[PDB]
Amino acid sequence: GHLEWQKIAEELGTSRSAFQCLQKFQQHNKALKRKEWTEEEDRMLTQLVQEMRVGSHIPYRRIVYYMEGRD
DNA sequence: TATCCTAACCAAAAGATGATTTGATTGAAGGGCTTAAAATAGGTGTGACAGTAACCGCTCGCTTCGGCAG
């Protein structure tokens, strides 16, 4: 279930640890790197942009702290 | 589409990696000692010497100045 990555590393059998396995998976996890879009992400992105943006300047990536699976 | 992620790459903050320059240290030498001795030749100031110097709780005895005396 993408959980207990110590067990995942042990099952891998190449002497990897949980942290390395998780790092590699997250760097190649479609669920994390959101090529997709969701309604709540769009709504909250619009809300934060409208709250903060002045003129043509918006906090393009500082919104990522609030919305998951982004950069 | 409006917008984004962030694979691989461009612009900028910050975060870091080694070579070079400047602030700082010091190793060795100029130097200028030491007592230890032995010595002739010396000059006087000064510091003892010494002196005067000066400055710094109860109960008797004794006395006087008037108020009548002479």
UniProtKB/Swiss-Prot annotation:
Annotated Myb-like domain ranges read 32-71
Disulfide links within the chain:
none
Annotated DNA-binding ranges come to 5-29
Domain of life (superkingdom): Eukaryota
Q: Where in the cell is it found?
A: Nucleus
What does the record note on quaternary structure?
A: Part of the SNAPc complex composed of 5 subunits: SNAPC1, SNAPC2, SNAPC3, SNAPC4 and SNAPC5. SNAPC4 interacts with SNAPC1, SNAPC2, SNAPC5, BRF2 and TBP.
This chain's function reads: Part of the SNAPc complex required for the transcription of both RNA polymerase II and III small-nuclear RNA genes. Binds to the proximal sequence element (PSE), a non-TATA-box basal promoter element common to these 2 types of genes. Recruits TBP and BRF2 to the U6 snRNA TATA box.
Q: Which disease is it linked to?
A: Neurodevelopmental disorder with motor regression, progressive spastic paraplegia, and oromotor dysfunction: An autosomal recessive disorder characterized by delayed motor development and developmental regression after the first year of life, followed by progressive spasticity with gait alterations, paraparesis, and oromotor dysfunction. Most individuals have cerebral, cerebellar, or basal ganglia volume loss.
Q: List the protein's name.
A: snRNA-activating protein complex subunit 4
The gene behind this protein is: SNAPC4
The residues of the intact protein that this chain contains are 313 to 383 of 1469
